[PDB]
């Protein structure tokens, strides 16, 4: 059965609720982004209206084979009417095609569902600026002050400089980047750009990337691995065994691997600055864990909420334990008392 924090009161709507069978009273199913915890349950056999971004709708049609007649893509930053209710989709600064959803309820209540997001001050000047929000359904992934990480721009600087140095010292080094979902494409695109290479990958992952409206993409990616010195592999293969095996396959073109695992937060964040990050090394293989996040840090989250001043907050992440729920509720009250709303 569908949990309460996936239902929008006063509407026939649910958000990211495809794994519960037919939800009683649901006339339209919204999908915030194409990540498997959120789309779980969709397929070519789904026959209700799905509302989403253009990019999410390209992925539904080409990767999950959802029939076109049930996909309802909406433009961003545009007031639209759905089953008699005004909605707006906003950029969530998560993965490609990810949105927040503003619902303007018939009774005057305004609700923001962030989906998954990385809060940013740029959001304080979208259509959110113009009106009050009564209820916020909040991505609370990293809702504790221990969760600090650098900007995406500092992390990419590190990666470009690390890759460029290594391959200039050794022109026979290969760079490998791990992936398991959409998101974090800047990591591998920025490294390939500095090296003057295309990114090489499987047909399945190439297909996924061709659904994302990224400009000049035919210029940056390829299925011809032999022509590329930046390769993408599944995240599970980014270990010494899996990389040794890959190097065998390249037929003596390369004699060294430098590999990147973009993670979210890890506890080495609570000690080490990005500048000071070092790899794990075995022989001619080095692996860098880099803290490239597509979710809000604690401070980014707190700033957004203190700017928005919602009347009620409903967490959508970490909701399964009483200790997590109590922790989150204590921070929400702090923020409200400090800011005065
Ligand atoms: Ni996500």
Same domain, 80 and 139: yes
CA–CA gap between residue 169 and residue 286 (Å, rounded): 15
Residue 83 sits in a domain whose CATH number is 3.60.15.10
Residue 139 sits in the same domain as residue 13: yes
Q: Are residues 36 and 81 in the same domain?
A: yes
Structural resolution in Å: 1.5
Taking the centre of ligand 1 as the mean of its atom positions, its distance from the CA of residue 295, in whole angstroms, is: 8
CA-to-CA separations, 9 to 104, 115, 127, in angstroms, rounded: 11, 17, 22
Nearest Cα residue to 286 out of 237, 234, 250, 239: 239
Give the determination technique.
X-ray
CA distance 265 to 180: 16
Neighbours of ion ligand 1 (CB under 5 A): 35, 116
75 alpha carbon – ligand 1 mean position (Å): 20
Domain with 341 in it:
1-147+296-341
Q: Residue 274 corresponds to which tokens in the numbers above?
A: 């990005």
Phi, psi of 30 (to 5 degrees): -90, 145
d(CA 299, CA 197): 37
Q: 106 and 86: one domain?
A: yes
Q: Which residue has the tokens 């702090």?
A: 334
Task: Tell me, yes or no, whether 104 and 84 share the same domain.
Answer: yes
Number of structural domains the chain divides into:
2
Name the nearest CA neighbour of 187 among 195, 178, 196: 178
**Tell me, what CATH number does 247's domain have?**
3.40.50.12650
Q: Give yes or no: residues 277 and 189 share one domain.
A: yes
Q: Which two tokens stand for residue 190?
A: 């920025």
Measured CA to CA, the distance from residue 89 to residue 102 in angstroms comes to: 7
Distance separating alpha carbons of residues 208 and 203, to the nearest angstrom? 9
Is there a single domain that holds both residue 67 and residue 163? no
For residue 117, how far is its CA from the centre of ligand 1 (angstroms)? 8
User: In this structure, are 196 and 324 located in the same domain?
Assistant: no
For residue 209, how far is its CA from the centre of ligand 1 (angstroms)? 16
Q: Are 33 and 54 in contact (CB under 8 A)?
A: no
| CA–centroid distance, residue 98 to ligand 1 (Å) | 8
Residues 143 and 48 in one domain: yes
* Coil, helix or strand at residue 307: helix
For residues 247 and 318, membership in a common domain is answered with no
280-282/285-291 β-pairing = antiparallel
The rounded Å distance from CA 82 to ligand 1 centre is 24
**Which DSSP symbol is given to 140?**
-
**Cα(237)–Cα(207) distance, rounded to whole angstroms?**
20
Q: Find the 183 Cα to ligand 1 centroid distance in Å.
A: 8
- Give the distance (Å) from ligand 1 centre to CA of residue 116: 5
Shared domain for 101 and 176, answered yes or no, is no
β pairing state of 13-15 and 7-8: antiparallel
Residue 26 sits at φ, ψ, to 5 deg, of: -85, 120
């Amino acid at each position: 059965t569908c949990p309460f924090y996936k239902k929008i009161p006063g509407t026939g709507f649910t958000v990211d609720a495809f794994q519960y069978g037919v939800v009683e009273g649901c006339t339209a199913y919204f999908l915030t982004h194409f990540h498997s915890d959120h789309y779980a349950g969709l397929s070519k056999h789904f026959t209700f209206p799905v509302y989403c971004s253009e990019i999410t709708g390209n992925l539904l049609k080409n990767k999950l084979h959802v029939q076109e007649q049930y996909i309802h893509p909406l433009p961003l930053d545009t007031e639209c009417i759905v089953n008699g209710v005004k909605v707006v989709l906003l950029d969530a600064n998560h993965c490609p095609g990810a949105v927040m959803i503003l619902f303007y309820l018939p009774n005057g209540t305004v609700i923001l569902h962030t989906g998954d997001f990385r809060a940013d001050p740029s959001m304080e000047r979208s259509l959110l600026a113009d009106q009050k929000v009564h209820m916020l359904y909040l991505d609370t992934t990293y809702c504790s002050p221990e969760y600090t990480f650098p900007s995406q721009q500092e992390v990419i600087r590190f990666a470009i400089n690390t890759a460029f140095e290594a391959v200039t010292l050794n022109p026979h080094a290969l760079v490998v980047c791990g992936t398991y979902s959409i998101g974090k494409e800047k990591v591998f695109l920025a490294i390939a750009d500095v090296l003057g290479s295309k990114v090489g990958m499987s047909q399945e992952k190439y297909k996924t990337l061709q659904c994302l409206n990224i400009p000049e993409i035919n210029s940056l990616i390829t299925t011809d691995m032999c022509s590329s010195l930046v390769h993408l592999l599944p995240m599970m293969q980014i270990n010494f065994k899996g990389l040794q095996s890959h190097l065998k396959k390249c037929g003596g073109k390369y004699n060294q691997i430098l590999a990147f695992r973009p993670t979210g937060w890890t506890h080495s964040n609570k000690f080490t600055r990005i500048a000071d990050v070092i790899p794990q090394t075995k022989g001619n293989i080095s692996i860098y864990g880099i803290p490239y996040s597509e979710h809000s840090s604690y401070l980014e989250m707190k700033r957004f909420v203190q700017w928005l001043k919602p009347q009620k907050i409903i967490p959508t992440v970490n909701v399964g334990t009483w200790k997590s729920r109590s922790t989150m509720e204590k921070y929400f009250r702090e923020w409200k008392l400090e800011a005065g709303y």
